[PDB]
């Protein structure tokens, strides 16, 4: 598998190529609703939902010293009646058998377990998070404001940028990885043009195994909001260093 | 799933995204060998092997009047000690649960059943075949020469072009479907530039279900040859009519 690409303009309730985990489901109006809702569509507490694309990605190959580039383009929106809505949505990459960890319904975003969430040697997760909940006596690892972060085997982001959450508004995101510069970059844009950029140097060959799956995760703990993925397109190609 | 693309520059023995059927196997030299060989690598009688890509393709959608384009580019070579090597290799599209039919190890190319092989209403197969065996008292449906054919729910090709088999030589093939003209085109070239073209008008929405898998099939009956797929790339995008 030297390359893979796919796109979802919207989401099909009869989709065949998506592994859904936890509370994730595709709605009648073709939106991927990651976190659980009640029967009126209102967000609920203590929920994780994730999706992965079914086909595995060859992220790198040691025998040929190849590493893949990738791009992930997606749009999402969040809704909540709360002044401190939680917890957030993330694009992520993990081993193919990745499953929702225990204790992840909350600030761990469905991605980490409490005992190991800040121990990089215990994890294999690369993620780009949109984090709306940052209370300093609880999400102690966060900066004290809403933020976009790049997470490298830890819920404490390697780097963040201050972000503004906008109730019901769709954010457009492009995540790219350049293996020649080992740079993971993120550009997020709201409809009025407000832009957010964050990037880190990261060697994926030390973070993740050779074969991975890619997808999204979201969670709510005591505070809550819906996490709605509208669309997603992904591409990856193995390249020589 | 609104688009899918993938590429195999060669074949990984540890590939994750290929469904292998029958005798198909990936060699230590990264070649997909569709038909069975003995302990010395010599081709044998009465064998079928097929592969499908794991991710399903949405080829069309009735309720929205969408139909997908597709392109499939691939290379293969055939080897045999026989004067009448058989039976051939085909790129094919079929329902996602497609399995090797009984009686298909021979001129039916792993694609059709003997009692229904020329009854279009009984089948759901679109294929581009490279057919090396054409004995008129046996493969009665074939022209009396080696040929490339487009098969629309029948082993009797809707159209063929005369072809020359070249022992051990790689043929490079591009198959494309244009939904706006309903045209399926095939262009095949040998390394010296010798070219073969064949095309048909076919409405895939009357041939195949909305979701399909794509792949290759090969078979040998009483006469035999190896069928070696070297590389394959595919793309499909679902579009409005
Ligand atoms: C009001 O909720 C805040 O205060 C509570 C009492 O101290 C905390 O338990 C609570 O933490 C949980 O919810 C948050 C927000 O969903 C989540 O990030 C965290 O991991 C816990 O699940 C929160 O700080
Ligand atoms: C010597 O093989 C030829 O003659 C036999 C007796 O007439 C046929 O049975 C035989 O047909 C089988 O093999 C061919 C070639 O592999 C295959 O195309 C066909 O479907 C049968 O399996 C062949 O004509
Ligand atoms: C971090 O994780 C490693 C690997 O699982 C473990 O051996 C180590 O004890 C952990 N360290 C801390 C400080 O928790
Ligand atoms: C062709 O197949 C159809 C559908 O399976 C069947 O009803 C019909 O009898 C067949 N026609 C033949 C064998 O001539
Ligand atoms: Ca947080
Ligand atoms: Ca034949
Ligand atoms: Mn954070
Ligand atoms: Mn034929
Ligand atoms: Na692939
Ligand atoms: Na909702
Ligand atoms: Na798959
Ligand atoms: Na995880
Ligand atoms: Na051979
Ligand atoms: Na006939």
Swiss-Prot record, chains A, B:
MF terms (GO), sorted A to Z: D-mannose binding; metal ion binding
Thermal activity profile: Thermostable. Retains hemagglutinating activity after incubation at 50 degrees Celsius for 1 hour. At higher temperatures activity drops drastically and is lost at 80 degrees Celsius.
Superkingdom of the organism of origin: Eukaryota
The keyword Glycoprotein is annotated on this UniProt entry: yes
Binding site for Mn(2+): 129, 131, 142, 147
Functional pH dependence: Optimum pH is 7-8 for hemagglutinating activity. Activity drops rapidly at lower or higher pH.
InterPro entries per record: ConA-like_dom_sf (IPR013320), L-lectin (IPR016363), Lectin_LegA_CS (IPR000985), Lectin_legB_Mn/Ca_BS (IPR019825), Legume_lectin_dom (IPR001220), Leguminous_Lectin (IPR050258)
Pfam families: Lectin_legB (PF00139)
Residues reported in the UniProt entry to bind a carbohydrate: 87, 107, 138-139, 221-223
PTM summary: Glycosylated.
UniProt keyword Manganese, yes or no: yes
Glycosylation sites: 119
PROSITE patterns associated with the record: LECTIN_LEGUME_ALPHA (PS00308), LECTIN_LEGUME_BETA (PS00307)
Similarity remark: Belongs to the leguminous lectin family.
Subunit note: Homodimer; non-covalently linked.
Protein's name according to its UniProt entry: Mannose-specific lectin CML-2
